[PDB]
Amino acid sequence: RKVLVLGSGYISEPVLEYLSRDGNIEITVGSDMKNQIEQLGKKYNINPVSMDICKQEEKLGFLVAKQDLVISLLPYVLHPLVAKACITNKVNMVTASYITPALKELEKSVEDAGITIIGELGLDPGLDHMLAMESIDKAKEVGATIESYISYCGGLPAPEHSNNPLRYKFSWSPVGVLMNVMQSATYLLDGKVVNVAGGISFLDAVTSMDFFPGLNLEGYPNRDSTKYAEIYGISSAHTLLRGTLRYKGYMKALNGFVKLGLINREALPAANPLTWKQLLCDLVGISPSSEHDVLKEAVLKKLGGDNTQLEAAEWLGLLGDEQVPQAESILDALSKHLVMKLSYGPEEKDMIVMRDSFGIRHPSGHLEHKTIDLVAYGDINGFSAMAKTVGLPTAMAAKMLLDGEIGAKGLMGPFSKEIYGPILERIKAEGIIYTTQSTIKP
Amino acid sequence: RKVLVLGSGYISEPVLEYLSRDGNIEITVGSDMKNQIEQLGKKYNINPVSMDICKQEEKLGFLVAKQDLVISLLPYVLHPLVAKACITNKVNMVTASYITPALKELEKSVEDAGITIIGELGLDPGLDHMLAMESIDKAKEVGATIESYISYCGGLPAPEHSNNPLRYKFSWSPVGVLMNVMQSATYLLDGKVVNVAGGISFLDAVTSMDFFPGLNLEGYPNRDSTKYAEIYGISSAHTLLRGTLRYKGYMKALNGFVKLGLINREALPAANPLTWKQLLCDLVGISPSSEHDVLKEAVLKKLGGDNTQLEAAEWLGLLGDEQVPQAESILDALSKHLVMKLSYGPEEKDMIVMRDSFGIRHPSGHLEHKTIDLVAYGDINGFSAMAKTVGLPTAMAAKMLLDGEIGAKGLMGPFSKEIYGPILERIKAEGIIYTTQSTIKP
């Protein structure tokens, strides 16, 4: 009846809410942010502690030893430090993020210590693993094999808040999503490995997504889908694809930012402070002059007469006299500015959409086409759909370890029926429902 | 502390829920349906009564006299019978429907009796009156006049349940909505009166609605918009238009039903019972024969090679061996069949969308363009968005009469600030929020 929550950020609130329901558990919180933990301590009954992880490893060892379990909501680079302290004191751990190559090396030490460390919980990774292995295990129960697996996913505003140039509102820092456009995408399709080129030409891979006629969606592939054959155990499959969902026009607007030279890690140009109008003059080539002058230069740079991309920049105030926020690069300067202009208000709803699609070959010979829809909306006077889908799987898994339901030991994901079965059933009560459909056509 | 709710239908549940919160009020229910009032009596504490209105007018007079207020949730043709009983016994009334020409004749008798009768509450009519007069009164507070008023509105499935040929699910009987396609539409636009022809050519008036880029909507005008100049007191306006919202493809599918000859009140054709395949053979002209034969005849009748309309009929089972439900006409037979195929399940969400747009001329000379968005989703384990928007205004208005907030007397709508102000503020807490925006551009 004692837990440590390392991290006082976005995901912490729904985790603290779920754990402090019965009343028996005693929650401790450790963080860098002094302002966050005070505001967080007002809402929920917790023991506040202030500490850095990589500098104050001495007190972490003593603090972890007092607890029954340790929940890590920190950046994924810092998990080996938290994992090392857990194996020494013989305490269980749960994580809401990737099991990195660095964390994988400890697996021998974690098994010898005789403790449980559950990684890759949340939305992605997390629910995508659980929904996949539910259907795959159901197929293997009747001797069937997987031929295809297509999975698109996506967090975005509720339709009523989609009227802006990007059709988007940022939950956290845009640096991650903006840099994904420059990266490559790899997947398997009808036997052949397909490579997609990132950067300026990545817009060519964007396709229309019409499974909901009322919802105007687009889609494109993720970083890597070929690694999931080994993870789920479906190397017999001829198709393996994972994608992302957005409203139509999103990627064309980001394509406009790539043309102008805003998506890079070069430093900002050096009496009077720098403005956005002045920054775009430097990028195009002209001197800091009139607003109508740089307008003619900007539209010339943005392909032909692409007024849509020009008006998108004009709307955000990129051809304007506002001050550029201080940052270590041009990309970071844009990211801070987008958080200012396109963030969620107090009463505005977010939304999660997910679409799985399986091609199952039964031993009879026929082909089953199975599809799963998961949809969830944010609450007005409550938690967001993104906060719930990332927070609740990690929180539910922690309660299962304390109550003693998960018997397995070592380092692992949520791939076993012991883990995913109980979690998928409990998220229905929290307002995360998923429907299933199935048809046959050899 | 005593109320009679005449009607045990769709709207009754949220009305009974709202009124029985404090506990002081005693609710009585009168209805034709014996099964409904038993099931309704299980959930909420009520006094059940069974009676017909036009046959048992004797007991209605005695029953109404016992109460402080009478809520009528019956068909609008029966309001003069309920109104006549109210004026005799000197009791207040509220209605969730139109104030008809028949009910308007009693206005002299209602004023002499010295009681309040509030009509035209709900969604439409109801909230449309309240949202209109809120903005119009705010304009007249600063000496401004109304030049334009455009109002589109619409109840429909949540985007995730829009994957069917009509992109729709019916809350009640389709007879009303199907017959609106055959009727005309009239409105004012830039000084000139516009008439729109109903029936086969009504599809030409359908336009794209792009105020939410994420939501794929279409729109078309309502029956009559010219009567609203006198109601709101905006005869100076050069534009008056009210429309309906649907997902794209809805009206093209209904256009297909008009071509085949399904939208009419002719009787059904007369050992073996009638099937849908046999009915479409009679309508096209051929004899009851093979399925592929009538398929070639049906596509020939549906304009050129319109496979979309053909597949829509095939999906619903109109070229199939299912039995036709018993009804007094072909339109009624279709309506019953659509309720069977396209109704809401237990866990499926509905949705309400509304969009007002004002052109306000200030005495300075400038033009203010004001817009109001109202959006609401149905609850999973609760009431639908349609049930809430129709039920709660009538229920809230009833509580204001009992508590003694509405001082005005006679027959009236919800046009006064005394009525609409308190209701618009209280619906926010129930999950019906509306945002406002305003810009200037002479």
Side-chain angles (χ1 to χ4, degrees), chain A residues 1 3-33 35-41 43-57 59-83 85-89 91-103 105-107 109-226 228-295 298-301 304-325 327-440 442, chain B residues 1 3-33 35-41 43-57 59-83 85-89 91-103 105-107 109-226 228-295 298-301 304-325 327-440 442:
Chain A
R1 305 182 294 93
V3 67
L4 169 57
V5 178
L6 298 170
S8 186
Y10 188 54
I11 312 310
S12 58
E13 290 192 54
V15 174
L16 294 185
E17 196 280 316
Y18 181 79
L19 293 165
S20 64
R21 284 184 179 176
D22 296 14
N24 64 306
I25 198 169
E26 194 182 345
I27 303 162
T28 310
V29 183
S31 179
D32 299 5
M33 303 294 171
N35 295 23
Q36 292 190 332
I37 198 166
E38 283 186 324
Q39 294 292 343
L40 190 61
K43 297 183 184 293
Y44 313 96
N45 295 331
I46 52 164
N47 297 336
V49 182
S50 185
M51 55 165 292
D52 196 299
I53 307 306
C54 54
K55 290 188 170 179
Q56 308 179 241
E57 296 190 340
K59 73 181 291 190
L60 182 56
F62 296 117
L63 187 57
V64 169
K66 296 168 187 169
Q67 312 302 330
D68 297 295
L69 184 139
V70 184
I71 308 173
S72 179
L73 306 174
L74 301 171
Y76 63 82
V77 72
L78 305 175
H79 294 324
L81 281 61
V82 179
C86 286
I87 61 165
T88 310
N89 300 310
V91 190
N92 296 321
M93 190 183 170
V94 294
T95 313
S97 192
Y98 296 99
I99 294 160
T100 52
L103 185 54
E105 291 178 313
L106 283 70
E107 188 168 32
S109 308
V110 175
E111 285 191 340
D112 293 325
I115 55 160
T116 314
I117 302 178
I118 311 176
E120 292 187 48
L121 298 164
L123 178 57
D124 188 355
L127 286 165
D128 67 322
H129 297 320
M130 296 181 205
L131 294 172
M133 296 298 295
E134 193 192 57
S135 300
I136 294 158
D137 287 334
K138 278 186 164 70
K140 292 182 178 181
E141 277 176 49
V142 300
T145 63
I146 308 296
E147 291 194 349
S148 66
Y149 169 69
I150 299 164
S151 172
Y152 281 72
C153 179
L156 24 52
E160 68 267 35
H161 306 297
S162 69
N163 188 42
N164 70 59
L166 310 186
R167 302 92 167 77
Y168 203 73
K169 286 185 180 288
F170 296 95
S171 305
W172 52 70
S173 191
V175 171
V177 300
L178 291 163
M179 205 70 198
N180 288 327
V181 175
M182 309 310 299
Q183 295 291 330
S184 67
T186 315
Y187 61 94
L188 190 68
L189 181 62
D190 300 316
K192 299 173 72 174
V193 178
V194 182
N195 292 300
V196 177
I200 196 71
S201 59
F202 194 81
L203 184 58
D204 295 315
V206 177
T207 57
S208 188
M209 295 283 149
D210 309 316
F211 48 75
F212 301 136
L215 209 61
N216 194 21
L217 299 181
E218 61 178 29
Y220 50 88
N222 287 3
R223 290 294 309 284
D224 186 51
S225 300
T226 55
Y228 290 81
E230 291 90 329
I231 297 163
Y232 301 142
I234 52 171
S235 56
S236 60
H238 63 79
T239 305
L240 289 165
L241 170 56
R242 305 194 322 110
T244 302
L245 296 176
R246 289 285 181 282
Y247 292 129
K248 294 205 182 171
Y250 176 81
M251 291 293 288
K252 187 163 180 292
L254 271 59
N255 183 263
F257 302 150
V258 172
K259 287 173 168 168
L260 296 169
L262 293 164
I263 314 305
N264 61 81
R265 300 192 173 284
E266 299 296 336
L268 298 168
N272 199 248
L274 184 62
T275 68
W276 277 101
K277 189 208 79 181
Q278 293 164 17
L279 182 53
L280 269 65
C281 289
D282 185 36
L283 293 161
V284 173
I286 65 176
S287 186
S289 71
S290 300
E291 201 278 332
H292 291 90
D293 186 47
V294 70
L295 183 141
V299 72
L300 187 140
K301 195 172 187 191
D306 199 315
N307 293 294
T308 312
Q309 292 180 338
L310 178 64
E311 290 165 47
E314 193 73 58
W315 190 93
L316 296 161
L318 305 179
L319 296 77
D321 303 318
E322 292 191 63
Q323 189 175 320
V324 177
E328 72 202 316
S329 71
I330 297 158
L331 181 56
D332 290 296
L334 183 60
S335 300
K336 286 190 171 76
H337 190 73
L338 293 165
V339 169
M340 197 190 299
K341 294 283 178 289
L342 300 170
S343 273
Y344 284 95
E347 299 187 329
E348 301 187 316
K349 295 170 157 277
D350 80 317
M351 160 165 126
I352 302 291
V353 178
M354 195 177 175
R355 176 79 168 196
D356 283 8
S357 185
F358 303 87
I360 303 159
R361 180 67 65 190
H362 292 275
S364 178
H366 64 266
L367 185 66
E368 186 193 341
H369 190 266
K370 196 176 186 178
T371 61
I372 296 167
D373 300 335
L374 192 152
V375 180
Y377 293 78
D379 302 316
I380 295 290
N381 301 123
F383 303 122
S384 73
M386 183 58 77
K388 292 162 70 168
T389 52
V390 179
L392 296 165
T394 311
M396 286 168 183
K399 185 167 163 59
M400 291 162 65
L401 283 165
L402 294 167
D403 295 358
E405 297 182 40
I406 301 161
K409 301 291 185 179
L411 189 67
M412 63 196 195
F415 303 108
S416 301
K417 194 180 284 185
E418 188 171 46
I419 304 161
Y420 74 73
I423 296 165
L424 287 167
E425 195 176 327
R426 290 167 191 182
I427 59 155
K428 294 169 188 177
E430 306 300 328
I432 305 166
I433 310 95
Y434 70 100
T435 59
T436 309
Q437 191 174 333
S438 189
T439 57
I440 300 164
Chain B
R1 305 182 294 93
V3 67
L4 169 57
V5 178
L6 298 170
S8 186
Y10 188 54
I11 312 310
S12 58
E13 290 192 54
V15 174
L16 294 185
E17 196 280 316
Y18 181 79
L19 293 165
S20 64
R21 284 184 179 176
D22 296 14
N24 64 306
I25 198 169
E26 194 182 345
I27 303 162
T28 310
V29 183
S31 179
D32 299 5
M33 303 294 171
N35 295 23
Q36 292 190 332
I37 198 166
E38 283 186 324
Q39 294 292 343
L40 190 61
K43 297 183 184 293
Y44 313 96
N45 295 331
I46 52 164
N47 297 336
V49 182
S50 185
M51 55 165 292
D52 196 299
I53 307 306
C54 54
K55 290 188 170 179
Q56 308 179 241
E57 296 190 340
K59 73 181 291 190
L60 182 56
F62 296 117
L63 187 57
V64 169
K66 296 168 187 169
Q67 312 302 330
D68 297 295
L69 184 139
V70 184
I71 308 173
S72 179
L73 306 174
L74 301 171
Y76 63 82
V77 72
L78 305 175
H79 294 324
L81 281 61
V82 179
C86 286
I87 61 165
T88 310
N89 300 310
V91 190
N92 296 321
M93 190 183 170
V94 294
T95 313
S97 192
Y98 296 99
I99 294 160
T100 52
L103 185 54
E105 291 178 313
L106 283 70
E107 188 168 32
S109 308
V110 175
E111 285 191 340
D112 293 325
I115 55 160
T116 314
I117 302 178
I118 311 176
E120 292 187 48
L121 298 164
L123 178 57
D124 188 355
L127 286 165
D128 67 322
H129 297 320
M130 296 181 205
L131 294 172
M133 296 298 295
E134 193 192 57
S135 300
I136 294 158
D137 287 334
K138 278 186 164 70
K140 292 182 178 181
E141 277 176 49
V142 300
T145 63
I146 308 296
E147 291 194 349
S148 66
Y149 169 69
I150 299 164
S151 172
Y152 281 72
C153 179
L156 24 52
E160 68 267 35
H161 306 297
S162 69
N163 188 42
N164 70 59
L166 310 186
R167 302 92 167 77
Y168 203 73
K169 286 185 180 288
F170 296 95
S171 305
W172 52 70
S173 191
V175 171
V177 300
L178 291 163
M179 205 70 198
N180 288 327
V181 175
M182 309 310 299
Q183 295 291 330
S184 67
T186 315
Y187 61 94
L188 190 68
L189 181 62
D190 300 316
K192 299 173 72 174
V193 178
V194 182
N195 292 300
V196 177
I200 196 71
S201 59
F202 194 81
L203 184 58
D204 295 315
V206 177
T207 57
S208 188
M209 295 283 149
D210 309 316
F211 48 75
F212 301 136
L215 209 61
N216 194 21
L217 299 181
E218 61 178 29
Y220 50 88
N222 287 3
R223 290 294 309 284
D224 186 51
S225 300
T226 55
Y228 290 81
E230 291 90 329
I231 297 163
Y232 301 142
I234 52 171
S235 56
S236 60
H238 63 79
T239 305
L240 289 165
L241 170 56
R242 305 194 322 110
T244 302
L245 296 176
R246 289 285 181 282
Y247 292 129
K248 294 205 182 171
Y250 176 81
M251 291 293 288
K252 187 163 180 292
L254 271 59
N255 183 263
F257 302 150
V258 172
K259 287 173 168 168
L260 296 169
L262 293 164
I263 314 305
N264 61 81
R265 300 192 173 284
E266 299 296 336
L268 298 168
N272 199 248
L274 184 62
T275 68
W276 277 101
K277 189 208 79 181
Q278 293 164 17
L279 182 53
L280 269 65
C281 289
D282 185 36
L283 293 161
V284 173
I286 65 176
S287 186
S289 71
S290 300
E291 201 278 332
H292 291 90
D293 186 47
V294 70
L295 183 141
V299 72
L300 187 140
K301 195 172 187 191
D306 199 315
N307 293 294
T308 312
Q309 292 180 338
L310 178 64
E311 290 165 47
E314 193 73 58
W315 190 93
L316 296 161
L318 305 179
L319 296 77
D321 303 318
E322 292 191 63
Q323 189 175 320
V324 177
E328 72 202 316
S329 71
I330 297 158
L331 181 56
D332 290 296
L334 183 60
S335 300
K336 286 190 171 76
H337 190 73
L338 293 165
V339 169
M340 197 190 299
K341 294 283 178 289
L342 300 170
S343 273
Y344 284 95
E347 299 187 329
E348 301 187 316
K349 295 170 157 277
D350 80 317
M351 160 165 126
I352 302 291
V353 178
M354 195 177 175
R355 176 79 168 196
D356 283 8
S357 185
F358 303 87
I360 303 159
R361 180 67 65 190
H362 292 275
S364 178
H366 64 266
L367 185 66
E368 186 193 341
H369 190 266
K370 196 176 186 178
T371 61
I372 296 167
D373 300 335
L374 192 152
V375 180
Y377 293 78
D379 302 316
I380 295 290
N381 301 123
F383 303 122
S384 73
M386 183 58 77
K388 292 162 70 168
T389 52
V390 179
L392 296 165
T394 311
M396 286 168 183
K399 185 167 163 59
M400 291 162 65
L401 283 165
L402 294 167
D403 295 358
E405 297 182 40
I406 301 161
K409 301 291 185 179
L411 189 67
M412 63 196 195
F415 303 108
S416 301
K417 194 180 284 185
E418 188 171 46
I419 304 161
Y420 74 73
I423 296 165
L424 287 167
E425 195 176 327
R426 290 167 191 182
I427 59 155
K428 294 169 188 177
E430 306 300 328
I432 305 166
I433 310 95
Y434 70 100
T435 59
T436 309
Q437 191 174 333
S438 189
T439 57
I440 300 164

